[PDB]
Amino acid sequence: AQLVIMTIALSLATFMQVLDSTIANVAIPTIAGNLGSSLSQGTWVITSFGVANAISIPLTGWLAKRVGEVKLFLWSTIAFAIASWACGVSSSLNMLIFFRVIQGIVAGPLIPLSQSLLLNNYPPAKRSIALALWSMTVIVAPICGPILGGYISDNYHWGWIFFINVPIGVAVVLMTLQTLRGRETRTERRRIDAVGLALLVIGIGSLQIMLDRGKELDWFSSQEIIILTVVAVVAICFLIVWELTDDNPIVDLSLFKSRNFTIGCLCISLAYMLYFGAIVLLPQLLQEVYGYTATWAGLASAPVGIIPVILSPIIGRFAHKLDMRRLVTFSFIMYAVCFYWRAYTFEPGMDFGASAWPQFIQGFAVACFFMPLTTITLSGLPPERLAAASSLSNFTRTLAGSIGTSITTTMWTNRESMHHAQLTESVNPFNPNAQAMYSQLEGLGMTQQQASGWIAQQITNQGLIISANEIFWMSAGIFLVLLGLVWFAKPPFG
Template sequence: MNKAPLKPLQGAQLGWITLALALATFMQVLDSTIANVAIPTISGDLGSSLSQGTWVITSFGVANAISIPLTGWFAKRVGEVRLFMASITLFVVASWLCGMSHSLEMLIFSRVIQGLVAGPIMPLSQSLLLNNYPPLKRSMALALWSMTVTVAPIFGPILGGWISDNYHWGWIFYINVPVGIAVVIITWGILKDRETPTEIRPIDTVGLVLLVVGIGCFQMLLDRGKELDWFHSTEIIVLSVIAVVAITFLIIWELTDDHPIVDLSLFKSRNFTIGCLCISLAFMLYIGSIVLQPQLLQVVYGYTATWAGLAAAPIGLIPLLLAPIIGKYGPKIDLRRLVTFSFIVYAGCFYWRAYTFEPAMDFAAVAWPQFVQGFAIACFFMPLTTITLSDVESSKIAAASSLSNFLRTLAGSVGTSITTTSWTQREALHHTRLTEAINPYNPLSQHTYESMGKMGMSPGQISAYLNNQITNQGLIISANEIFWLFGGIFLLLLVFVWFAKPPFIIGGGAAHRSAEH
């Protein structure tokens, strides 16, 4: 049934709903990274191996990747407010079950439930925020929402490491309970009478099955690929074939079905397509770097998980300060200029790291590029999200938000897999080349063995020490190569964003089309 559009929220109600929806997003994004550093602790406590423990991460990622693109269809069927309330409530219950799990099987089952119900949280928090904000303040809403998306992945490992070091790992999940309850109380109190129009749509059973199989297999091969040595594994080959076949048929089916479970017609909108491309590729590189850097600091430089997280934390300072300013003044300038500035700063920071990451690097050399990159983060999500949704009709914002968030989330998984795999493969290559220099015919090599032998070290100990140093050198060199590559890709992305067509007004799709005709 269709209802007349409600007036935007004002005053205290607007402030409270902004806080509640931002907390919901922060909680959901945080939960995708908070368990990563606690896997050794969880595995040891539940009596499982590390490889089995990684299913705590994989199970959440697979379930979440499947449920995000379904958000638009379910929101039309039951209403955005009801679906959001149900998702948050079930997320709290699943978090409680995760915390009280006494076996790995129970924890993985609870994480699957948690991932499935978490899917709608981020796209609906974005959609509800935009639909209840005055049009002139939507950029401010997006800026505040975007800040939580970028800061949460940084704080996840810090908080996860601190909790697992000082308390029972269950508190990684228990902290969602009071936050989720607060979100439910605030959101329901303000939005219970502001439900979006619903319509009864037939279930696209074929599309649903193809989506679950295709995206599920693709996410699993991303999560398991490195561990199983990618296409040297029969399991990965099988997953790849199933994923390619299922996703191909899914695209064909959804383009021809009258009531698709995923609305691919959104890609007819130029700005939506360009926005999704830019935000997904940029997020892929961003997530790849925030996964790579802590590992580099812990493996090579001996940082603890907490200190590796703290070294990354300065990236969140500038967005916290600039988000309100960009939200207020951003719409007054061409958003493509903001994105261009963001990508240039991203590229500059990656080149900066490539120059400064060396064996004698101190904490400041890590923290300063992170701090400066905060300027790129602040000018990234709000402008690109606005561009993405600018030629989408208001009634399709939930569907467009869920599809763009799905592509961005999937790109993050791809970025993680590609980055970590490239890092180890390049290290192996550099290790081989550097090792070739250590031989009896190299005067420097002979001198090193003689000098260290005089210190009381045996030939075996010297070889082990040199091997460790070569490994560290290889890891640093390969990380720097990745930083160089990422910087170059950001500069290439500058070209694509200028294909977007102004004006950039969220929910203005219908107006654009009527103006064109």
């Protein structure tokens, strides 16, 4: 059948972007080293893509209304394949940044355009099934990425991270051409608004730069961050004020007039903020405070996909007899349970299983959060506008993810510093079981200064674990309050 092949193709189209997003952050250390640059210098390889993608995502609908959805999809896929190949064969950090910028600008129309095509092409008899299948690919790729990324980083020369996308793009283009022939989309020509584009570029770029660079510059203690935040806020304020008054919609804000859309967008954005701000810490915690490797660290998040890979069809099959709101509430409760589980069970000598059961539990929470909330988000809208709504949803979700990461990292480091301060106090003279430690250390031949450094390192590790567990507790508590918001949405679902 053509439907199944099309489903596979669009799943791959939305899978490649997530794979590329997740793999680079894992591979950044070795890539930075091989090109004679530092971690701060190399981390620009991620911020550039972030800014480019952030700009590209909101603009999907404008190009959709003119170029044509199918043509845009095909052209974007081929261009992304070419850009990934170019990045893979780079030979300098600057050239890598350039090609990453191009790749990010190109890749914007993948996820929302793919979702819109899948939603429209499938007959309404199986809309729920199509949406259920789509949510899987966004829930499995983030874990399918880091394992392979680590294996490639530690075994073969980098560049094969950006080569795997070439065959995926080739298969996607071949299948799309062979399956979507004749299912064209109506177009329309309209005037171009310049102030809107300029205001969007400046504001969103400034916001992304501020979020991605705030940490190293100690946020508001650097004038650069201050000017960036000022320009961002001013651009967004004036830009938003304009769009509601603009005749030609560079961004279609009329969708916010629907109560369901507002509530769904807010809920998904905030829940995603919490999720993505939480999961980011675990890899770093394992690699730095426990000695894990990248491949082992990624392997600790495998048990999340065990549950969704099963329940996703079952939820899709039975969607006819469920009040989706109750699924959202259950998922929020399940996310609180998992984070409280992590909070009261992390210990310096915890085995691999101590950080694998909680993700097995989180599988349920992730499984029943994307499909229902996205079904509510796009409820009752006409078939033609599904593209713009998807673009808005994705833009908000990505913003939430970036914000969550930015807040969580700073909180982690600062609370680690506080705990370090509160701990190093006990290490003084006038204290038994403190000179004994020095005696045992000097027994092994360490100097006095080396022993002091070793004690300081141990205090640092303990502080990181305590600070990391303080963040999980806060996240779960915050979840407990976000529970009830999903009930404000009316039931026109369909």
